[PDB]
Design a protein around this ligand. Structure first.
Ligand code: HEM
Ligand SMILES: COc1ccc(C(=O)O)cc1
Ligand SMILES: [Cl-]
Ligand SMILES: [Mg+2]
Length: 393
């Protein structure tokens, strides 16, 4: 009844151009079976949204990568937030929501905006830059580690650790094997920075440790909650900013609109998140037999959700493959949906907004002027290198 496909969504050919295969996955049916990895797949907006919003049946505590924690040992101790279900999920989630709160955003916004303006001014002095290393990576590295309270030494481990985390959600392919082989120094750095003395006063990490006396989390849970912010924050934000820059270079008409109204910056970044979907996929594991898309799925089955595909499903979006900075983006699943929907989305949107604002006010043209190189990762979509010339306004 359900169609079986041989597409490997973790193959390098797929990462190089996923969009035809994503249409094949959507058009084969609401629920497919991926024979390569023995998992169910859902690639249409409707089923992805449904799975995300039914956490009791489609749980996260057996892992959100291919590996089922009831069958195999997790490669690192489970996240207390991403890899927990309600009710254990609820109070750690509340702590992170309060650490990354609207009030925190109000405290840090002016500094984040000044750093974005300064970065764009610096890049305009050079003219020809790499929009990944010099902009998409450099800007978040110039604000987020400081906002965390991390010391200067060792920050070169942050992006590699993130890459490892996201490769480890994938199947046991070469990308995953090599990531875990290289993991020791990055893991050692990250775990040590999670301890209370190593997080500067007033930053996100110190605030997590200060939140250990309310009955929501205990002191021994704070290191792993800091670890979450050192796992899934930087690389996907970098990839989203890089995708926004790529889109503004490839769609110059949209840079022209953004220049004419810099208040479009926040939505231009949200649209880049939908269009690129830096986090392409996550898994859930069924806890009981369930009907989904007319199919019956048994207990203990992995279900692969194609977030990027759901964000390009023509059943839900008009002209899904176009970058449109005035699109009504509400409802996209680039940050997930439901109880696990990105707790750090306010930070990501702040960083993306203020960078696109700086570009909107300061840059007249963004022209690709060298070979564009893609970075392969089992879960993240993003560029390795984006050579551009920036023309000042
Ligand atoms: C464009 C940038 C970002 C993207 C695309 C993104 C994507 C996502 C997605 C799709 C989820 C849902 C996971 C699931 O349903 O299993 C999520 C959760 C999460 N994100 Fe983000 N994220 C971004 C930035 C950030 C930032 C900046 C932070 C921290 C400051 C952060 C921290 C987290 C955490 C801790 C969770 C787990 C929430 C939970 O399980 O309740 N993310 N993110
Ligand atoms: C969305 O990606 C992630 C990855 C890791 C974590 C975590 O380690 O808690 C959270 C979100
Ligand atoms: Cl680890
Ligand atoms: Mg090797």
């Amino acid at each position: 009844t359900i169609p079986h496909l041989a597409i490997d969504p973790f193959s390098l050919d797929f990462f190089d151009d996923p969009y035809p295969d994503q249409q094949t996955l959507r058009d084969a049916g609401p629920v497919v079976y991926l024979d390569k990895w023995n998992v169910y797949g859902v690639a249409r907006y409707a089923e992805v949204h449904a799975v995300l919003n039914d956490p009791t049946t489609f749980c996260s505590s057996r892992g959100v990568g291919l590996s089922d924690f009831k069958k195999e040992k997790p490669w690192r101790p489970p996240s207390l937030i991403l890899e927990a279900d309600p009710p254990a999920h609820t109070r750690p989630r509340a702590v992170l929501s309060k650490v990354l709160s609207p009030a925190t955003m109000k405290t840090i916004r002016d500094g984040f905006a000044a750093a974005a303006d300064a970065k764009v001014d610096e890049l305009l002095q050079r003219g020809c830059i790499d929009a990944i290393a010099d902009l998409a990576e450099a800007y978040p590295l110039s604000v987020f580690p400081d906002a965390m309270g991390l010391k200067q030494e060792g920050r070169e481990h942050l992006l590699p650790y993130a890459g490892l985390v996201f490769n480890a959600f994938g199947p046991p392919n070469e990308l995953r094997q090599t990531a875990i082989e290289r993991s020791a120094p990055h893991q050692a750095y990250v775990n040590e920075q999670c301890q209370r003395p190593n997080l500067a006063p007033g930053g996100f990490g110190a605030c997590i440790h200060a939140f250990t006396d309310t009955g929501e989390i205990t002191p021994d849970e704070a290191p792993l909650l800091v670890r979450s912010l050192l796992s899934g924050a930087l690389q996907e934000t970098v990839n989203g900013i890089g995708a926004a820059v790529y889109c503004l270079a490839r769609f110059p008409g949209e840079l022209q609109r953004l220049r004419s109204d810099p208040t479009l910056a926040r939505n231009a970044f949200e649209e880049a998140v939908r269009f690129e979907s830096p986090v392409q996929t996550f898994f859930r594991t069924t806890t009981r037999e369930v009907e989904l898309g007319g199919a019956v799925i048994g207990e203990g089955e992995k279900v692969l959700m194609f977030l990027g595909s759901a964000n390009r499903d023509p059943r839900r979006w008009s002209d899904p493959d176009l970058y449109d900075i005035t699109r009504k983006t509400s409802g996209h699943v680039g940050f997930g949906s439901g109880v696990h929907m990105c707790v750090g989305q306010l930070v990501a949107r702040l960083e993306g907004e203020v960078m696109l604002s700086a570009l909107a006010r300061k840059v007249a043209a963004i022209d690709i002027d060298g070979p564009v190189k893609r970075r392969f990762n089992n879960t993240l979509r993003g560029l390795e290198s984006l050579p551009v010339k920036l023309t000042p306004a």
